[PDB]
């Protein structure tokens, strides 16, 4: 029997069709019925019925019972090819999801197909399905994500790899460059939009804590001229909604910040072949300026690696820097003022903290928009153009003076090699705003810092209060002494007389007792409140013990980075690699990207002798060489390949040491006689500065 009068299938009806079509040795009616009902959206809506009307476990049994062969598996391949175009325009024009929410069914049925992972769907079937899913309404995507969030890690992995190899295949299959972009490739764009649904299913399905949120960062008030304009337009009361956010973030109500432990590591969602071909100069353009058929991948930053995300942030800051250039020109033109396109910073080498404090504090009041100018640092006495080398020198100097033990700002931990906010630091809120500004300024001006912070600091910068989980990185010894209490099988009240009162050691040495509760001395620690005491203990040290120091630090960081997509693009774990750099010194990647000037070439005799010397350098001498040539001993985001070094010839053989132009990573190399002479002068040059 052909079964030519049935439109909806059932968990047991496919079973009876299969059993009657099995011993008769003619599966063709089954092929026909599957190709009929699966290629029709309305048929799939009523198929395999019972926040969804489709029995989840029913279809999984049906697929595994029926896909074991080689004929019908082709029918599902071809049925998807026909169903998808009729279900994409149906969502795009007819608006069929609003009429009834049961239309989402067919997407669960299709995504339950195991063969979607197979490489026979990447050509025609999967790309067409992803086009249809990317046209689902926001409410429809919310239920699909919530339904997908209940899956296990292995199930989510299959879903993620399904769209990952589709992106990988289309990048490999097609040739993308500045002429033919990836942004206008609808197949990759749709697969990226579908990957976002899995990404948020990963987020909202893991360990999510949306409650331990820090206070809203104080938004810097615009300039007085801007405030006057809003009054004239009658908009001074209403305020801007805030930074750009993903619409799926609002619909689901859960942010990636709230996700502590996703089911799948976030780094698995990065499609590397896509990143090597993306052009972020035009990706940023489609991010800010809407285009009819161009899609920005910055709207899905989970897929970009650190290097690509760093580029997109660089273009945003660069563009904002240029807008400050045009404003000063107009001010000099129209108002007859002096051309100042720079955040001028005159400081003294011996008083760098105080001089930068008074200069940057004064700016934050009078003209807070000056912080958006390109940073220009000049030291007193020494006069020269700041092309970046002086700013790099200034950034290095302030970090040492800020994190020096004597200033009392931060306490260094020997075991973790990390600095933590010193709670015993009083009357220093100005300096904490300074180091917050410096960190934001380093990001704004694309300079990496030698800053060692626990991950909790970067979590708190984005507005998440530190929890007991964060105590391990900050204070491992106290974290160990607190979880040991957590899993104490015996009576905690009897064995240890610890109560809700804690003793803190000051820098001087005198301990003062702090009370976590109203009367913590009276109340002892019992098994009932043992969990609460640890929560209050961790909440105090990470959040309440340093609340004033961190409030100023967070405020200074905000006044520089508030308009950047930094909060949008970067998770807190990615902030540390952005502010700092890689500690890995891959001098091979440094060799490949190195350029030559003054007559030098990759085949010059001294050049080969130079690379032989530096590849035989120790780690300490490699750091000395990096600091001497580029101004920092840390590699940029990515690696030393991104540090586009230039070795330029500097005159004939001599006793003069090689020099460096730190601003442009240029090494000025005299043409020395031999390799031994080159090493002696190069070692003398980098071990002196």
């Amino acid at each position: 029997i052909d079964f030519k009068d049935v439109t909806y299938l059932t968990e047991e009806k496919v079973y009876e069709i299969l059993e009657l079509c099995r011993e008769r040795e003619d599966y063709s009616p089954l092929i026909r019925v599957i190709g009929r009902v699966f290629s029709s959206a309305e048929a799939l809506v009523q198929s395999f019925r019972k926040d969804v009307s489709v029995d989840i476990d029913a279809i999984r049994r049906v697929y595994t019972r029926l896909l074991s062969n080689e004929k019908i598996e082709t029918a599902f391949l071809n049925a998807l090819v026909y169903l998808s175009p009729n279900v994409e325009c149906d969502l795009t024009y007819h608006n069929v999801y609003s009429r009834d929410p049961n239309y989402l069914n067919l997407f669960i049925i299709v995504m339950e197909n195991r063969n979607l992972h197979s490489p026979e769907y990447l050509e025609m079937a999967l790309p067409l399905f992803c086009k249809a899913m990317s046209k689902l309404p926001l409410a429809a995507q919310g239920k699909l994500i919530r339904l997908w969030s209940k899956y296990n890690a292995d199930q989510i992995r299959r879903m993620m790899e399904t769209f990952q190899q589709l992106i990988t295949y289309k990048v490999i299959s097609n040739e993308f460059n500045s002429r033919n972009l990836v942004n206008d490739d609808d197949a990759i764009v749709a697969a990226s939009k579908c990957l976002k649904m899995v990404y948020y299913a990963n987020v909202v399905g893991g360990e999510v804590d949306t409650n331990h949120n820090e206070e809203d960062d104080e938004e810097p008030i615009p300039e007085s001229s801007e405030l006057t304009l809003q009054e004239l337009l009658g908009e001074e009361r209403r305020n801007k909604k805030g930074p750009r956010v993903d619409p799926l973030e609002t619909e689901l109500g859960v942010k990636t910040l709230d996700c502590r432990k996703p089911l799948i590591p976030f780094e698995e969602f990065i499609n590397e072949p896509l990143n090597e071909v993306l052009e972020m100069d035009k990706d940023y353009t489609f991010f800010k300026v809407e285009t009819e058929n161009k899609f920005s991948f910055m709207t899905c930053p989970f897929i970009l690696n650190a290097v690509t995300k760093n580029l997109g942030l660089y273009y945003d800051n660069r563009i904002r820097m240029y807008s400050e250039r045009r404003i000063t020109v107009l001010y000099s033109l129209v108002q007859g003022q002096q051309l100042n396109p720079y955040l001028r910073l005159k400081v003294r080498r011996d008083h760098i903290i105080d001089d930068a404090l008074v200069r940057l504090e004064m700016i934050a009041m009078e003209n807070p928009a000056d912080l958006k100018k390109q940073l220009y640092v000049e030291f007193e006495g020494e006069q020269g153009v700041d092309e970046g080398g002086v700013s790099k020198e200034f950034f290095q100097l302030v970090v040492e003076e800020i994190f020096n033990p004597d200033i009392g700002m931060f306490t260094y931990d020997e075991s973790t090699k990390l600095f933590w906010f010193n709670p015993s630091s009083f009357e220093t809120e100005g300096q904490f705003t300074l180091i917050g500004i410096v960190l934001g300024l380093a990001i704004y001006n694309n300079c990496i810092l030698d800053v060692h912070f626990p991950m909790v600091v970067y979590r708190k910068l984005m507005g998440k209060k530190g929890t007991f989980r964060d105590l391990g990185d900050s204070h491992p010894v106290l974290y160990q002494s607190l979880k040991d209490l957590l899993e104490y099988e015996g009576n905690v009240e009897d064995d240890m007389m610890i109560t809700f009162q804690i003793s803190q050691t000051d820098l001087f040495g005198n301990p003062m007792m702090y009370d976590l509760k109203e009367n913590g001395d009276k109340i002892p620690i019992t098994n009932e409140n043992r969990k609460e005491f640890v929560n209050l203990y961790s909440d105090y040290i990470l959040n309440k013990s340093v609340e004033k120091q961190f409030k100023a630090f967070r405020r200074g960081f905000h006044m520089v980075t508030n308009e950047s997509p930094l909060k949008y693009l970067f998770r807190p774990e990615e902030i540390e690699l952005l502010i700092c750099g890689s500690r890995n010194l891959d001098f091979q990647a440094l060799e490949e990207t190195t350029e030559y000037d003054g007559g030098y070439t990759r085949d010059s005799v001294l050049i080969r002798e130079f690379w032989e010397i530096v590849h035989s350098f120790t780690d300490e001498q490699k750091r000395l060489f990096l600091q001497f040539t580029t101004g920092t001993d840390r590699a940029p985001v990515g690696g030393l390949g991104k540090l586009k070094m230039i070795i330029a010839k500097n005159g004939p053989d001599t006793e003069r040491l090689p020099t460096s132009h730190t601003a442009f990573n240029v090494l000025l190399l005299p043409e020395y006689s031999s390799k031994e002479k080159l090493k002696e002068r190069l070692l003398k040059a980098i071990t002196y500065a």
Binding site: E226, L233, G234, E290, I327, L330
Partner: protein, 141 residues
């Protein structure tokens, strides 16, 4: 004008309160403190601008200061650009029900100007949550 709500926020109400007409009222720019020209007063009323009170005194804006600071706001506070269709989807409202001003002169866009924006696929710009377009006077070469 001590009372915040009582003091007029628009030019006709200010003229009525002072028992004068827009044909004779004397106003100063809030920025340059210079007396507004008559055509500047007419532009101020035509552009549906709000009277600004500094130290309990009604102020307006001159044409050159308005254009200068609108240019500064566009340069420094620009957020992103949208198509008119995408604007309507975002607000679920027709463009005629959205207050969109000219990016240059801050004149509220007429429905015909917003229709031209839709027709030519010209993008609307956001500047601190203010949606701006280009008016006909500022659209001409």
């Amino acid at each position: 004008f001590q009372d915040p709500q009582e003091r007029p926020r628009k030019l006709p109400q200010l003229c009525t309160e002072l028992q004068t007409t827009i044909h004779d009222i004397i106003l100063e720019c809030v920025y340059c403190k210079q007396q507004l020209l008559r055509r500047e007063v007419y532009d101020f009323a035509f552009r549906d601008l709000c009277i600004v009170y500094r130290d309990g005194n009604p102020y307006a804006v001159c044409d050159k200061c308005l254009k200068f600071y609108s240019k500064i706001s566009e340069y420094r506070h620009y957020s992103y650009s949208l198509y008119g269709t995408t604007l309507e989807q975002q607000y679920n409202k027709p463009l005629s029900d959205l207050l969109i001003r000219c990016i240059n002169c801050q004149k509220p866009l007429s429905p015909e100007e917003k229709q031209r924006h839709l027709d030519k696929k010209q993008r609307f710009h956001n500047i601190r949550g203010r949606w701006t377009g280009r008016c006909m006077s500022c659209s001409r070469s």
